[PDB]
Paper text:
The mGeos series of rsFP’s display similar switching behavior to Dronpa. The series was developed from mEos2, with mutations that remove the undesirable irreversible green-to-red photo conversation, increase fluorescence brightness and provide high thermal stability of the off-state. Skylan-NS represents a further improvement, with reduced per cycle bleaching and higher photoswitching quantum yield in the on→off than Dronpa.
We collected datasets for the dark on-state using two different methods at the SACLA/EH4 station using the DAPHNIS chamber. Firstly, by using the grease injection method, we selected relatively large crystals of 50–100 μm in size. The hit-rate could be carefully controlled with the crystal density, and levels of 40% could be sustained with crystal densities of 4.8 × 107–9 × 107 crystal/mL. Table 1 shows the CC* and R-split values that reveal data from the droplet method was lower quality than that obtained from the grease injection method. An increase of the R-factor for the increased resolution (<3 Å) is likely indicative of genuine structural differences between the grease and droplet methods, in agreement with the observed degradation of R-split and CC* when merging intensities together (Black). Following complete refinement of all four datasets, both on-state structures showed no statistically significant density in either the 2Fobs-Fcalc or the Fobs-Fcalc maps that could be assigned to a trans chromophore structure. The same was observed for chromophore omit maps, that also, at lower sigma levels, did not show such density. This is in agreement with the dark incubation and dark sample injection which corresponds to a 100% on-state concentration.
Numbering used by the authors: 2 to 61, 65 to 219
Write the structure that this text describes.
Amino acid sequence: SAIKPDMKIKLRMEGNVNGHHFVIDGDGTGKPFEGKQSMDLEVKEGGPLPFAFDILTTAFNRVFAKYPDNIQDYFKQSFPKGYSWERSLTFEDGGICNARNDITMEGDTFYNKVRFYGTNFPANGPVMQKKTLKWEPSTEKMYVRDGVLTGDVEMALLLEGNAHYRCDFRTTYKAKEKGVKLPGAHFVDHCIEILSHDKDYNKVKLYEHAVAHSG
């Protein structure tokens, strides 16, 4: 009821990876009930980025997921006040990232305040050498841990030379308003894709389709 079938999205990300500082703006639209969104991104400071753009893409909102009637939708029930999430990303060669997003809504627009910090990526590894191609489609497991809604996903970045580079996500999600009821455990399938880009990934168009289910 707060959430319309078509919503606009505004975003700013600030961050630092291996010491490199950057600022990225996003402008997008999506369909919350169909689980589809896309976004145009533009690096404003720090470009051309010296690391694989792909590590950032899942930090650029689980409101855009199709939920069936039989699973409580914690994210759509969080609005208009909104919610926040914090994520750790643990890569198999020791790279580590922490990201957060604080999401608010004004009228027909979501605003996103995103922070992304990464460290310990080996200078000779696929992230700093820009050898990544895409994330594989994934399944996030949603459950409650110590009273907090938690999503785990085992992610894989396809690399040049048909190898995958693995990363474990853990995200915690918290409604701003007390007493939004927690859902039962469930799954969210995701597919995220870079649809287009320019030479050094200073301008990128991103898309995600996500669908909640019970297994």
